[PDB]
Design a protein around this ligand. Structure first.
Ligand SMILES: NC(=O)c1ccc[n+]([C@@H]2O[C@H](COP(=O)([O-])OP(=O)(O)OC[C@H]3O[C@@H](n4cnc5c(N)ncnc54)[C@H](O)[C@@H]3O)[C@@H](O)[C@H]2O)c1
Ligand SMILES: NC(=O)c1ccc[n+]([C@@H]2O[C@H](COP(=O)([O-])OP(=O)(O)OC[C@H]3O[C@@H](n4cnc5c(N)ncnc54)[C@H](O)[C@@H]3O)[C@@H](O)[C@H]2O)c1
Ligand SMILES: NC(=O)c1ccc[n+]([C@@H]2O[C@H](COP(=O)([O-])OP(=O)(O)OC[C@H]3O[C@@H](n4cnc5c(N)ncnc54)[C@H](O)[C@@H]3O)[C@@H](O)[C@H]2O)c1
Ligand SMILES: NC(=O)c1ccc[n+]([C@@H]2O[C@H](COP(=O)([O-])OP(=O)(O)OC[C@H]3O[C@@H](n4cnc5c(N)ncnc54)[C@H](O)[C@@H]3O)[C@@H](O)[C@H]2O)c1
Ligand SMILES: O=C(O)/C=C\C(=O)O
Ligand SMILES: O=C(O)/C=C\C(=O)O
Ligand SMILES: O=C(O)/C=C\C(=O)O
Ligand SMILES: O=C(O)/C=C\C(=O)O
Lengths: 308, 308, 308, 308
């Protein structure tokens, strides 16, 4: 069977194990720094297997040796934000955690595809690629799938249609300057502008950018995990099943969109080899302007990163 | 449980029972004019239930009384074409069969949504609405979902991407003058023209229009059933689960696109109440020209219909 | 669509919503007394729908009016236990909570099947039946499905076989005195005693009885929720899809197994009408002695309850 | 991705592809000797993928070279029987077909697990093992899963319970002499004898034995394929996902049940390595007498085979 290791067994990591288990994609290893917690969550989920009918070994551990030879490594060990904070405010604590986790896991699974989740996403993904030394196509960050999912959900709710018929591309860094692309969003191939008024669509674009913060303010003691885990699981599935999915993920740019040496949310074809192709869309002046402002925000986090 | 009756237990009807059973949407009644055949197919499929794990009663019958109080009626009793024929060539034989089936089933399930499949689709759907006297929104024809699925498949194959990320709208009568709409087709919200060259996309549009005939010429003894059944099942699912799907189905027009008193392949929101809304797309001159040529072909079949 | 209301949006409640949404069984209403929490978890789960592909309306609320006319009501509002604590220790606190919830929800959904989860399970289910005034067969408690799932997981691990081929019955109150039944345990119809030696099987039985405590000790801050939620969801599903599942649940007894006027873990047929029939197994002397011991335990908590 | 080759694109073969595609287990290659037929069914099934949402490459062919390096090979190229005919009557025709297929496919996929379906099952599986020269544990026949499924369906119908809670073992050759085992039949761990009276259970056992004939008489033009295909697919799945399923299949015996040098229906653990272990049930006098009768039947066909 395929092997998937999830580093960090908190809200997002455990929920990610849940989505993956139900899919019977492969055996799962939940690792954490806290003793007992990952073992308990993995056993609890494993005990659900006879009810749901999936044959997947789910095991909790505190030892990186158990993650050896994984096909995919998911990183969800970062600290989450609380109300009033930005994802960037977590960069110091999480840079340390990320370096720690990647330095230990990466060497044990040299052929794995690493999927970063820790925030600030784009910067943490860059760090992981550096600490691991893995081919850039095998180190990606999850962010766009979740952001576009929030957008797609708001459209479905607004238009009163099935979430199964809404598609949307969203680019940029996983933050406030995120760039949802209405012009690149459709319902069964039909432009969303044909279903929703411009002013209303504008409010949806804004709600999408502040979507993470909306949940943080509701939960008050933590951030989102159901959709984030689903998004991560979808990317894991893309790799394990070599589905060649077209989705936005933080990938390493070498000139696309006029950007070099940076991890940025861009449309890619994701498969068994990780990022198999970075797509270069014909954005207009307004879109490019928003994208550049996003690339600037991301570069800003990378500059903070290098000063740590 | 919900009840679904499938009139005509041949290739498309039985395959449709298969797709539906696996979804555990409701009990299924397979009716046919031939004795034994529907009973055998329904029992064979029912015996697969312990293996797959679905609890759905699947029963074969030769008596319309068994289809009483169905939530959805699927009609697949028409004769299929052989190599060298057009769907229109079946209108005489199938007009009789359709009238026969609808006159018997419709009265027994007054609250059902009828989904026609018999070819020529648009004309047979018009006939069914007339013979049944049901509210027009509850009498629809399956055709666009299948046509757009063939198109979406060719795009996925051509672009080398996941079929899960391809969306496409296709309009018109279910025939040679069918109108696939490249401008209304995307991959994760991105126009298909960004993935495929115009000349290649043109060949795909053509293959889509002649897609049914392609299979007929390969099988030689019959026509397609796997995709047609999937398409039909998806529409059944849309109604039973009130999913508000946006898909192209033959619906009754009263002025949309400048067309009145005709069943034509158009984009609709499909739910528990059947067609809950007919969408009017801003087609350009070239598209409207193709659509009108299609509306003309359909009107031609309706004129043949009235002379029977 | 069917409507499911979950009272108590904590670990089990929210996780049950997750399992339920993935099955697209109906719209879900997550209610809690803490403001924002349910709204946040519901929105988060909702935003995952475009990724997973399920059309389910998940709404969080602090108002019981929103639960009106539900097909099923799940009660997961009770306080969980902390390490070194027995489920019975929660009786006073959870009796007040359970009473408050049932009294506000029952009147608004008179035709609903109530599934209790709050511990001590058996006594809370009884309290629910008494507060709702509902037909006894429409007020049941989840416990046996979870306990049996743990038991099945253990034997699957021990024997090295698929969890899909392991079934087992388990009876009694949800506590240390529960009674797993090895004699009524099989692997593809074959007695488990053929796969696991008596000594090891005895250990598995003991682990099952202490299974809940095992998780609480590992997590230290709370109790299990992945399997507990999957169990609750399988019961909700049995009801909504009228599957006629044969499973152990807490049902009201009037003489079965020689027990009367008590909610106790017994095998039943679960369907749209709730408990449609209580099965009466031919237990031997060994098993009955265990069952009677468990009954005395449940009776004791019932005595504590009636005296609160 | 995993690769599955189906030799014989008829009713069972094509239907197996359908069940397999829906599970997204791997790419499927449908091979047939008749030109166009496999290509047509494959394309048709492929065109259904955008509707169902599975990324599976289904290719039809008339060239064995395309089956090279498959993980699993399904053999469904045998001629089916017509009413008033026994499965044994197909031995000469199907021996030539089976021989021709195996000799061309085996060499190209030396690491594959071969699953025989052609009737007479037991004798064809033996012939396959002898022609391929493969390890006996990697050449098995489908029969018991189907027979047991029918038996389980009947008891589910009779008892009025979910097909998900019914398990049963069945042994022996795939024919009139097959041996269902009521003693090794349970409903959620409870003996079926507790649900169905002896007289009725005896009728169910008889129906199971004649189950295949029942379908052939109803269809008149061919034999079953929905359950047969689901059975074959569950076995393919057990192998590809290394599930360790406990199921009856035709395996090579070297003394188990006192039988040697014969492929016979026995319970096994099925996983990535094929038959990983043959279970030896403690059968009583009644059961062994039946098993020995069945063994003599299979041996007889084996005698006919070796003398062809
Ligand atoms: N779209 C996205 O990219 C996205 C979405 C949601 C959350 N996130 C981010 O993901 C991270 C996880 O969020 P969460 O809510 O699951 O948090 P959490 O606090 O629930 O879980 C993090 C887990 O990591 C563990 N941990 C800490 N240091 C570790 C180390 N060195 N090694 C192994 N495990 C360690 C903790 O003990 C904890 O169980 C946060 O940084 C959050 O902001 C990103
Ligand atoms: N996209 C579409 O709309 C679409 C796709 C595929 C096929 N079709 C059409 O659907 C029909 C069915 O195709 P098929 O391949 O399943 O054909 P088929 O010949 O396999 O099956 C038709 C079944 O109808 C039964 N039948 C005939 N008269 C009947 C009557 N009066 N009452 C009840 N049953 C009766 C037959 O006995 C037969 O079993 C054809 O007309 C075909 O062209 C439409
Ligand atoms: N029967 C079983 O098999 C089983 C399995 C697991 C847990 N349980 C029990 O289920 C209960 C819930 O466990 P948990 O881990 O989810 O706990 P939790 O503390 O995470 O969640 C309980 C939720 O109830 C809410 N709540 C409290 N009073 C309320 C009221 N009056 N109305 C509405 N909501 C209210 C809280 O605010 C909280 O969100 C516990 O009593 C636990 O012991 C039973
Ligand atoms: N073991 C079971 O439980 C079970 C269940 C059902 C059917 N069967 C048996 O399975 C076989 C297939 O049944 P069916 O209903 O699908 O039959 P079918 O006639 O529909 O299909 C057989 C296919 O094999 C093809 N074929 C013939 N010779 C070939 C060769 N040399 N190479 C490649 N393809 C070749 C045919 O052209 C045809 O498409 C029969 O022998 C039947 O008795 C076994
Ligand atoms: O807002 C957060 O902190 C986490 C969810 C996200 O990254 O969108
Ligand atoms: O071509 C046919 O006759 C049937 C398939 C379709 O209607 O596309
Ligand atoms: O032990 C607990 O408190 C919860 C899980 C269970 O009831 O098994
Ligand atoms: O009876 C037949 O020929 C095929 C079905 C089976 O083998 O059961």
């Amino acid at each position: 069977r395929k092997k998937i290791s999830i580093i960090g067994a908190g809200f997002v990591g455990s929920t990610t194990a849940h989505w993956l288990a139900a899919k019977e994609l492969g055996d799962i290893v939940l690792l954490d720094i806290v003793e007992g917690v990952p073992q308990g969550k993995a056993l609890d989920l494993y005990e659900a297997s006879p009810i749901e009918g999936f044959d997947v070994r789910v095991t909790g551990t505190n030892n990186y040796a158990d993650t050896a030879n994984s096909d995919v490594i998911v990183v969800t060990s970062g600290a989450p934000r609380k109300p009033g904070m930005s994802r960037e405010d977590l960069i110091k604590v999480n840079a340390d955690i990320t370096r720690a986790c990647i330095s230990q896991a990466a060497p044990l699974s040299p052929n794995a595809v690493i999927i970063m989740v820790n925030n600030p996403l784009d910067a943490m993904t860059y760090l992981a690629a550096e600490v691991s030394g893995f081919p850039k196509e095998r180190v990606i960050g999850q962010a766009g799938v979740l952001d576009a999912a929030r957008y797609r959900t708001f459209i479905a709710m607004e238009a009163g249609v099935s979430v199964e018929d809404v598609q949307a591309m969203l680019m940029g860094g996983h933050g406030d300057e995120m760039v949802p692309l209405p012009r690149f969003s459709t319902i069964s191939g039909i432009p969303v502008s044909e279903f929703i008024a411009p002013d209303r669509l504008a409010q949806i674009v804004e709600r999408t950018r502040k979507g993470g913060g909306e949940i943080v303010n509701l939960l008050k003691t933590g951030s989102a995990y159901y959709a984030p885990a689903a998004a991560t699981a979808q990317m894991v599935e893309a790799v394990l099943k070599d589905k060649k999915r077209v989705m936005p993920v933080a990938a390493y740019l070498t000139g696309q969109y006029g950007l070099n040496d940076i991890y940025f949310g861009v449309p890619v074809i994701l498969g068994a080899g990780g990022v198999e192709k970075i797509l270069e869309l014909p954005l207009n002046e307004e879109e490019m302007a928003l994208l550049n402002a996003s690339a600037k925000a991301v570069r800003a986090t990378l500059d903070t990163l290098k000063s740590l």
